[PDB]
Amino acid sequence: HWGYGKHNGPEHWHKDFPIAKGERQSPVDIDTHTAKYDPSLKPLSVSYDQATSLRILNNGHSFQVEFDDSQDKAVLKGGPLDGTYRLLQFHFHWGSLDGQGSEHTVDKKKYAAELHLVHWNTKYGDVGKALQQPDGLAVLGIFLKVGSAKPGLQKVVDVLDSIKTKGKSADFTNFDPRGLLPESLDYWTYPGSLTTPPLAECVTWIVLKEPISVSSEQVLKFRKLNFNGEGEPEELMVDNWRPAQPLKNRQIKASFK
Ligand SMILES: NS(=O)(=O)c1cc(C(=O)NCCO)c(SC2CCCCC2)cc1Cl
Numbered sequence: 731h732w733g734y735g736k737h738n739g740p741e742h743w744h745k746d747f748p749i750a751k752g753e754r755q756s757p758v759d760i761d762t763h764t765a766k767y768d769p770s771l772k773p774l775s776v777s778y779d780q781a782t783s784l785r786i787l788n789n790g791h792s793f794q795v796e797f798d799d800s801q802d803k804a805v806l807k808g809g810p811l812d813g814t815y816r817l818l819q820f821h822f823h824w825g826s827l828d829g830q831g832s833e834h835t836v837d838k839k840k841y842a843a844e845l846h847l848v849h850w851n852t853k854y855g856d857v858g859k860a861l862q863q864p865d866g867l868a869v870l871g872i873f874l875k876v877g878s879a880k881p882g883l884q885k886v887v888d889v890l891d892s893i894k895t896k897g898k899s900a901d902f903t904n905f906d907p908r909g910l911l912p913e914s915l916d917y918w919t920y921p922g923s924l925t926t927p928p929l930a931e932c933v934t935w936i937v938l939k940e941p942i943s944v945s946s947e948q949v950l951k952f953r954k955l956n957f958n959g960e961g962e963p964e965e966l967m968v969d970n971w972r973p974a975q976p977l978k979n980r981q982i983k984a985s986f987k
């Protein structure tokens with residue numbers, strides 16, 4: 731029943747998911763002058779050479795590109811993490827207007843969109859068990875600004891008309907997620923939560939400082955998606971972002987000075 735409307739959006743979620751008002755909720759504003767450089771943080775090891783994408787799905791909240799996570803094939807290691815995190819899926823959050831759409835903000839700046847690569851800690855064996863642990867998931871977050879097209883995004887944008895409505899999926903094999911990364915892996919990190927219900931507090935957030943540029947045509951195709959299912963009234967899938975939450979007793983650390 732949750733969503734992003736006036737009636738069912740972020741200010742309502744706490745009634746079904748009381749952790750919404752918890753101590754380590756996401757997203758947050760990243761105050762760049764308060765984040766402390768941590769010389770002990772390691773470079774982020776993104777190993778996506780063996781990634782096996784399988785499918786793309788309109789889940790009614792976002793669209794997601796899913797991967798085979800039954801073996802280490804696409805993994806995130808290093809940075810603030812202990813151990814090995816397998817890539818499950820990526821999805822986006824976007825706005826109705828280019829001045830909004832990201833969940834994390836940087837000195838209160840909103841980006842047009844935000845990409846989340848969702849990974850789970852292999853020690854916990856499966857993602858449902860990982861959801862129950864404070865170090866269960868790691869999300870690599872990447873900001874999108876509107877300018878030049880991102881060539882590595884076009885295969886995704888070109889299949890969206892086939893998954894226009896909630897519950898539609900399409901085979902999506904041989905997609906390389908390396909094409910969605912910026913040149914620099916400099917990042918901020920903090921302990922947080924899912925930004926969508928159940929808002930579980932199990933995520934180590936790794937947010938890249940460098941945003942990727944996507945064209946206005948690419949983000950317009952995201953805005954043609956629908957939150958509704960086939961044969962129901964049309965509600966464009968836009969503004970599917972949760973606003974920044976209180977930082978509370980948390981420190982954001984920077985990998986770079
Ligand atoms: N915006 S986020 O914090 O990066 C995030 C989003 C999703 C996600 O796909 N949410 C849509 C509703 O299920 C998931 S999927 C998750 C898989 C296990 C069951 C709970 C949802 C995971 C994360 Cl970390």
Ligand SMILES: [Zn+2]
Nearest residue numbers: 821823846925
């Ligand atoms: Zn997300």
